[PDB]
Amino acid sequence: LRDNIQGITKPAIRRLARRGGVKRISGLIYEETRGVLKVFLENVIRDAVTYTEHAKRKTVTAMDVVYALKRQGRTLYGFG
Amino acid sequence: LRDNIQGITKPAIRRLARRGGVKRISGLIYEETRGVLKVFLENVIRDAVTYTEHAKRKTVTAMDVVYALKRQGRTLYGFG
Amino acid sequence: RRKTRKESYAIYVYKVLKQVHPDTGISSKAMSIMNSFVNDVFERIAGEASRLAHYNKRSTITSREIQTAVRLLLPGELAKHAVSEGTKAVTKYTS
Amino acid sequence: RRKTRKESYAIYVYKVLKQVHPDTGISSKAMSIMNSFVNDVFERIAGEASRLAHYNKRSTITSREIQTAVRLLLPGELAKHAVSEGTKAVTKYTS
Amino acid sequence: KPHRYRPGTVALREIRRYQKSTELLIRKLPFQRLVREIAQDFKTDLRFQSSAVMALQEASEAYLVALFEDTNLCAIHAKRVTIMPKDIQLARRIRGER
Amino acid sequence: KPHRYRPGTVALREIRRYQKSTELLIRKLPFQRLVREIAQDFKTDLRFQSSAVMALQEASEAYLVALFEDTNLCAIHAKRVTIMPKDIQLARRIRGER
Amino acid sequence: GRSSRAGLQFPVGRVHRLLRKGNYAERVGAGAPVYLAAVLEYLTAEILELAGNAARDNKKTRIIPRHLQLAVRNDEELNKLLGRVTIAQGGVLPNIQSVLLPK
Amino acid sequence: GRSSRAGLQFPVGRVHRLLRKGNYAERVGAGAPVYLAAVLEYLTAEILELAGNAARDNKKTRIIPRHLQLAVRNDEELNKLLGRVTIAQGGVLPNIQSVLLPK
DNA sequence: TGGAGAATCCCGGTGCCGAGGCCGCTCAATTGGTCGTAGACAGCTCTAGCACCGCTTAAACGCACGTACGCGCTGTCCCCCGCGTTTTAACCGCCAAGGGGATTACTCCCTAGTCTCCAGGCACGTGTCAGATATATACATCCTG
DNA sequence: CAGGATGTATATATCTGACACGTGCCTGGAGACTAGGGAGTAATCCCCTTGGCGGTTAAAACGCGGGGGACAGCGCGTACGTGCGTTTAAGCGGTGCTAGAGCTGTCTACGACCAATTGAGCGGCCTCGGCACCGGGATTCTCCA
Structure with missing residues (x-):
């Protein structure tokens, strides 16, 4: 795959800002938000793939993601 | 003892702000800073006293303070 | 055949729910969230009692370590009512 | 008489310092900070390796768990050079 | 004259809409493609569960x-x-992420 | 007219002086008295080490x-x-203390 | 059983097993799984009571994750316990700042 | 000894004893304390070399806590490792914002 | 201030799939002894913490003066919002392989446990030198003319 | 731009206490041996992930008018910085007293462990009703004359 960071669209970032309570949104917010989300997902997916390849699996399970989040102080309830 | 929070004087708060890189300080900063320091010290001394009276001691050692800071994510190196 | 004997906390959380709100039920996603919550605060109280046993050169987790871990981890009047509940349960268990 | 037999890390940190900087010494407060640093990094890597062994339902901490804990905990190229140093030491040790 | 809302009312309307909903606000397939693109730089030929x-x-x-x-x-x-x-940069560097 | 520094220069001088030093900037006895007054609310007749x-x-x-x-x-x-x-209130709300 | 000897709904024996097999200490006392099961039952009863109240306020007889999120983010003690916790499909609290409202 | 069989300066046997008596798992492999002592010795050597360079730039021959603090905060990876860590008698990094400097 | 219009809320009606209860079974919890070490408790010693006191002096406090910065106001323009129209790709339902997760069986090697010994590391002394401080001197910078 | 004043970096003496090293000793680490069970590996099954396809349709993209908000300039006053003189506790050293921390020894209750048993809890399945959705009216909020 190549360049699916533009798959995080402008109305999706606007919906996340509306849930965040934001009334007015500058036009440069979208590339900043895409970079922030890419950095967060790189850190979590890196830890989840480390947890996965320790278990000698090829499948990233939901428990690997929950543990990868748990070791960033971002505990996630609902997936075991 | 009563009302020792005024022992954290205005020049001491100004020195801590100078170390923090602050050039100009409002006059209402000192009561807000004294309240913030009292809240921090209450949470740390409460945890250190809990660690102390678990050990059936009467003296709060530096190790109890180091553990009480370590369990809040403000790990302190230098005292064991 | 059958897969595997996944232990969880779902039936105890359901008994607790049925004794607090006798006509309110729960969803499967909410039951998974409550199971994750019980495992989370179990691992917090146990990992604080383990540290309290390690700091005092002890090798036993007792109800005094669990009580100190509850007073360290729970905020405010949670650590007052949970300590009272646990002390009451240990007292009536030893009888 | 003597009081008690404290297992610090000070002589090993001093050997490491004498091998990276043969003319530089170290103060007692800085030696206490380096001892606290080594204990902290030790109990973080050991806690993460314990947690990895508990996740995969294993009973043994091996060098594979310690290597995965180092890759999880250390940032960037710290985790690239520390895995190389540990693998080199384990390869030397089993010879 | 066709009706036209003033700038800020509909924004508050969708603040009240999306602070009441529980759904996911990103589309699922673009996020899944982004996840698999990010995970391609760590290990090739990875699989993901539906819940991961x-x-x-x-x-x-x-x-x-x-x-x-x-x-x-x-x-x-x-x-x-x-x-x-x-x-955003101020919030991220006050939180301790930069 | 004698010498007089402008407002902001001695402030920057103190910033460079205290960002170069390592001392404790609060006095020892008022802070120790404040610690013993806060610790009175949790246990009576407590005792502290010099290092704590x-x-x-x-x-x-x-x-x-x-x-x-x-x-x-x-x-x-x-x-x-x-x-x-x-x-201060914004910095503590963003860090997640209130 | 030990769950009914202590007057509890949570499994004292299973908590005892998880403590003995969780690598927590070299030995585990007798009253420690009883205390920990009682604390877990109290902490479950609080979040379930607040979630059932928040479910009844939305005229529903079943707890969804939204009611759990509302229960924990309104309650101050549970919000300090669960500050760094994301509840899946929980949403956020309805909260608009005062400067964003019409004048 | 096992410290010299592996080529290390850190005690493989003491790390083995702390892993056995530290309540981490039910068994401890033989290459785990070798690996952990090597990682600890590397991570000690890195902070000690940066602290010795910071001491030499201050024209001192002894490391004080100021040089350790400068070493760990002038480096991106050690600051990411030690972000939530206070070093006693360490001070801060010299940093003035550009808005506070005069025209 | 009030009417038009758009939006949201409520109120009944239908379908559906997920919660809730039952059933069979198996494996983990319980019970009963037996043992052996952890820890509770008594006792004793010695460290270190608390309290007081005198003296020096550095920091805190309070006040005066002035400046420069916070804040409110005004103007401008441009950028973001609301909305209509066209397009695109998500989504849902369906289908088909097949990769790999998950479980079982079995063997064997690696680690716990025990015992014996000895040397590595720790506490305690001890000398000496790196830094702290005092003091004079030289360069850098700030400020007002 | 120029010079005076102020502060800070720099070089030299000198003095002290802390650090680097030496010494005894003891306890914890290493070596050797044995037993057993965890895990590595092979083999099989079947779940569930990936890929593809086609119709729906809702969301996304794009363009456009306009208004309101961001930002820059300007002015005013007040509050905070700087500095000076007076005051007040902090800091340091010196001493004394005793509470309690820390260590040792003894004993016993308590938890680990092992074997037998059974019922509590878990997977599967089955049913029905809470809720998601749909259509229609009712209230509520906003906006422009």
Whole structure:
């Protein structure tokens, strides 16, 4: 795959800002938000793939993601 | 003892702000800073006293303070 | 055949729910969230009692370590009512 | 008489310092900070390796768990050079 | 004259809509493609469970919503109602992520 | 007219002086009295080591300095150079303490 | 059983097994799984009571994750316990700042 | 000894004893303390070399806590490792914002 | 201030799939002894913490003066919002392989446990030199003319 | 731009206490041996992930008018910085007293462990009703004359 960071669209970032309570949104917010989300997902997916390849699996399970989040102080309830 | 929070004087708060890189300080900063320091010290001394009276001691050692800071994510190196 | 004997906390959380709100039920996603919550605060109280046993050169987790871990981890009047509940349960268990 | 037999890390940190900087010494407060640093990094890597062994339902901490804990905990190229140093030491040790 | 809402009413309307909903606000397939593109730089030919990408999407949207909730406070602190990239950078460096 | 420095130069001089030093910037006995007064509310007739109060003072001054850095960033964000209680309250709400 | 000897709904024996097999200490006392099961039952009863109240306020007889999120983010003690926790499909609290409202 | 069989300066046997008596798992492999002592010795050597360079730039021959603090905060990876860590008698990094400097 | 219009809320009606209860079974919890070490408790010693006191002096406090910065106001313009129209790709339902997760069986090697010994590391002394401080001197910078 | 004043970096003496090293000793680490069970590996099954396809349709993209908000300039006053003189506790050293921390020894209750048993809890399945959705009216909020 190549360049699916533009798959995080402008109305999706606007919906996340509306849930965040934001009334007015500058036009440069979208590339900043895409970079922030890419950095967060790189850190979590890196830890989840480390947890996965320790278990000698090829499948990233939901428990690997929950543990990868748990070791960033971002505990996630609902997936075991 | 009563009302020792005024022992954290205005020049001491100004020195801590100078170390923090602050050039100009409002006059209402000192009561807000004294309240913030009292809240921090209450949470740390409460945890250190809990660690102390678990050990059936009467003296709060530096190790109890180091553990009480370590369990809040403000790990302190230098005292064991 | 059958897969595997996944232990969880779902039936105890359901008994607790049925004794607090006798006509309110729960969803499967909410039951998974409550199971994750019980495992989370179990691992917090146990990992604080383990540290309290390690700091005092002890090798036993007792109800005094669990009580100190509850007073360290729970905020405010949670650590007052949970300590009272646990002390009451240990007292009536030893009888 | 003597009081008690404290297992610090000070002589090993001093050997490491004498091998990276043969003319530089170290103060007692800085030696206490380096001892606290080594204990902290030790109990973080050991806690993460314990947690990895508990996740995969294993009973043994091996060098594979310690290597995965180092890759999880250390940032960037710290985790690239520390895995190389540990693998080199384990390869030397089993010879 | 055709009816036309003033700028800010519909924004508040969708604040009240999306702060009442529980759904996922990003489309599922673009986020899944983004996850697999990011994971291609760590190990080739990876598979994901259906709940792993859902867990990543729940965590990512909670992260971004809780960062916009702080960005909005940084915008209101500067006596604005628009959020700006300097507000995001301020929130991220006050939280301790830069 | 005698010599007189302009407002802001000696402030920068103190910034360079105290960002170069390592001393404790609170006095020892008022801080120790404050610690014993706070500890009176949790247990009566307590007792402190000499090193425990120094570890509390080190941690407290590091906490307040690392809060004043964030407060300075919040003040600079609003295009000011004075820090205000609204900057402290914003910095603590973004860090996640209230 | 030990769950009914202590007057509890949570499994004292299973908590005892998880403590003995969780690598927590070299030995585990007798009253420690009883205390920990009682604390877990109290902490479950609080979040379930607040979630059932928040479910009844939305005229529903079943707890969804939204009611759990509302229960924990309104309650101050549970919000300090669960500050760094994301509840999946929980949403956020309805909260608009005062400067964003019409004048 | 095992410290010299592996080529290390850190005690493989003491790390083995702390892993056995530290309540981490039910068994401890033989290459785990070798690996952990090597990682600890590397991570000690890195912070000590940066602290010795910071001491030499201050024209001192002894490391004080100021040089350790400068070493750990002037480096991106050690600051990411030690972000939530206070070093006692360490001070801060010299940093003035550009808005506070005069025209 | 009030009427038009758009939006949201409520109120009944239908379908559906997920919660809730039952059933069979198996494996983990319980019970009963037996043992052996952890820890509770008594006792004793010695460290270190608390309290007081005198003296020096550095920091805190209070006040005066002035400046420069916070804040409010005004103007401008441009950028973001609301909305309509066209397009695109998400989504849902369906289908088909097949990769790999998950479980079982079995063998064997690696680690716990025990015992014996000895040397590595720790506490305690001890000398000496790196830094702290005092003091004079030289360069850098700030400020007002 | 120029010079005076102020502060800070720099070089030299000198003095002290802390650090680097030496010494005895003891206890914890290493070596050797044995037993057993965890895990590595092979083999099989079947779940569930990936890929593809086609119709729906809702969301996304794009363009456009306009208004309101961001930002920059300007002015005013007040509050905070700087500095000076007076005051007040902090800091340091010196001493004394005793509470309690820390260590040792003894004993016993308590938890680990092992074997037998059974019922509590878990997977599967089955049913029905809470809720998601749909259509229609009712209230509520906003906006422009």
